[PDB]
Design a protein around this ligand. Structure first.
Ligand SMILES: NC[C@H]1CC[C@H](C(=O)N[C@@H](Cc2ccccc2)C(=O)Nc2ccc(-c3nnn[nH]3)cc2)CC1
Length: 231
């Protein structure tokens, strides 16, 4: 996250860190708890993941440095990528992880509601870079970002097809954005004091550049897909 601040424990309890363990253990992508057995993330995260056997889902993490050899994690039973997905920039950038067992919800691990509205209180969160050439951050970062219209977003990405299945967010002057390692995490919007998972962090041109908003999977356009897959 560029131009963000440190989160505190329990601030974003639906935020997970998805680790790969091949050839070494490291953060791969963010994700969001949407059900006791269900993580919503980006399809692109799984490019060259050989199978779910190498994945570990960590919930209730603030600092990456908390994760040791005895730290509990969830195994991944199944990766469900949208059948029309080919590439992040071409949309359908959405995936479910079915966990091997149920998350018992606590102060530190809680589900986020799907959307059913003008969202004015939207936040992007993750352990990603603070600038284009950087490293994964120890402490989960947060930044408040304004949504932009799909009409404005298309004008900034004339090499790409921006559809109603995408939502864009960013400042005209730049300064705050998702960056490398934030993908798959949530764009969380608070509406009537309830948090909604409005976006999944997907792609963009660089990080926090002027007139280059972040592009997110528009979760409300996939609610029927999610409900079909989650039963
Ligand atoms: N301004 C809009 C932003 C929107 C999110 C974008 C993003 O995050 N894309 C992923 C793609 C990706 C995900 C997973 C695997 C390969 C590639 C990505 O780049 N991840 C990534 C990179 C680097 C490390 C890494 N680990 N250690 N050092 N670097 C770890 C994950 C950046 C643009």
């Amino acid at each position: 996250i560029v131009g963000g601040t440190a989160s505190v424990r329990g601030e974003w309890p639906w935020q997970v860190t998805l680790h790969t363990t091949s050839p070494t253990q490291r953060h791969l992508c963010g994700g969001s708890i949407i059900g006791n057995q269900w993580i919503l993330t980006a399809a692109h995260c799984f490019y060259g993941v050989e199978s779910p056997k190498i994945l570990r889902v960590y919930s209730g993490i603030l600092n990456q440095s908390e994760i040791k050899e005895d730290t509990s994690f969830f195994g991944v039973q199944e990766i469900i990528i949208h059948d029309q997905y080919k590439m992040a920039e071409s949309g359908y950038d959405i995936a479910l992880l079915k966990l091997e067992t149920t998350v018992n919800y606590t102060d530190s691990q809680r589900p986020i509601s799907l959307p059913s509205v003008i969202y004015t209180d939207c936040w992007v969160t993750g352990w990603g870079y603070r600038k284009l050439r950087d490293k994964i951050q120890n402490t989960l970062q947060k930044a408040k970002i304004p949504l932009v219209t799909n009409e404005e977003c298309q004008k900034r990405y004339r090499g790409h097809k921006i559809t109603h299945k995408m939502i864009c967010a960013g400042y005209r002057e730049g300064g705050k954005d998702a960056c490398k390692g934030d993908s798959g995490g949530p764009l969380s919007c608070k509406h009537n004091e309830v948090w909604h998972l409005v976006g999944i962090t997907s792609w963009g041109e660089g990080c926090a550049q002027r007139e280059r908003p972040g592009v997110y999977t528009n979760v409300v356009e996939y609610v029927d897909w999610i409900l079909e897959k989650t039963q």
